[PDB]
Amino acid sequence: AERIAFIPKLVGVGFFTSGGNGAQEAGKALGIDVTYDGPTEPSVSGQVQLVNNFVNQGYDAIIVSAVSPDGLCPALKRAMQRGVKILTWDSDTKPECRSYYINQGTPKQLGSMLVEMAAHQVDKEKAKVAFFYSSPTVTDQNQWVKEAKAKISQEHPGWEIVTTQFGYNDATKSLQTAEGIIKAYPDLDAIIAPDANALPAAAQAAENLKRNNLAIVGFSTPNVMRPYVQRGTVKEFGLWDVVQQGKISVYVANALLKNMPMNVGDSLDIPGIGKVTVSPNSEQGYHYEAKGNGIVLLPERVIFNKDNIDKYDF
């Protein structure tokens, strides 16, 4: 009867495949056919054509992880203007281009995870720390880093951030930068890397240089990190349950399809997950006041270590 599209930044990558799995199973449980499709490469045009096609075929809702905050807006507004329910997950668009953003966590939440992981490992009052991520321009990562650095200055005043460098979402560049950091700061206490490429790069660099006991924390995926965790190079790192994220998105979309829109403050109880609530867009750095528009945060994120890392496959 009703159809939903779940679009990732690209297919063929665990994180997105699993998000799609959570979405599709949620659809089956709700009696709504969910189509999973994305471009072979992360690009605006690759996602836009898919959005336009789903709208043209008469899909009832589209859930997407935006490659660009503005790039999909024209297509998404057209969709909403035609009656299609639009939601975002993982990466959000400008608030006016969707109804709800199924968000893994606010900048303060994610920034806190980074510092809490580092503090768990660091054993010196005057610890030397290095930040290592994508770029000084990437919006989301910089929001997390701004929050992390603030938390460090406020709660761990003895620490010193000795350097902040970037890997530019490039495996080769990331490894090179990581080794440079490790070679230049032999007494470094920790590397905080809130980037999927930067984290594995830092661990690989430590192993390449035979550097021991360096605290290496950040954000990345289970399958990529497992080898480093098994060797002891990385004790902990964070992210979230992408399967549950996909699942939640379909449940929120279902609420809209069932004419039970939720305004900031309203809640929805999802089986196996619990209750989710709509919170203000302002918490993400971009205020936007409108009915049936807001953010739905995951009840929790995940800290992976040797004990629970095998429970996830992406």
Curated annotation (Swiss-Prot):
It is found in: Periplasm. One of its GO terms (molecular function) is carbohydrate binding. Transmembrane segments: none annotated. It comes from the Bacteria. Pfam families: Peripla_BP_4 (PF13407). Its main location: periplasm. InterPro entries: Bact_Solute-Bind_Prot2, LsrB, Peripla_BP_I, SBP_2_dom. GO terms for cellular component: ATP-binding cassette (ABC) transporter complex; outer membrane-bounded periplasmic space. Keywords: Periplasm, Signal. Belongs to the bacterial solute-binding protein 2 family. Part of the ABC transporter complex LsrABCD involved in autoinducer 2 (AI-2) import. Binds AI-2 and delivers it to the LsrC and LsrD permeases. The complex is composed of two ATP-binding proteins (LsrA), two transmembrane proteins (LsrC and LsrD) and a solute-binding protein (LsrB). This is Autoinducer 2-binding protein LsrB. The lineage of its organism: Bacteria, Pseudomonadati, Pseudomonadota, Gammaproteobacteria, Enterobacterales.
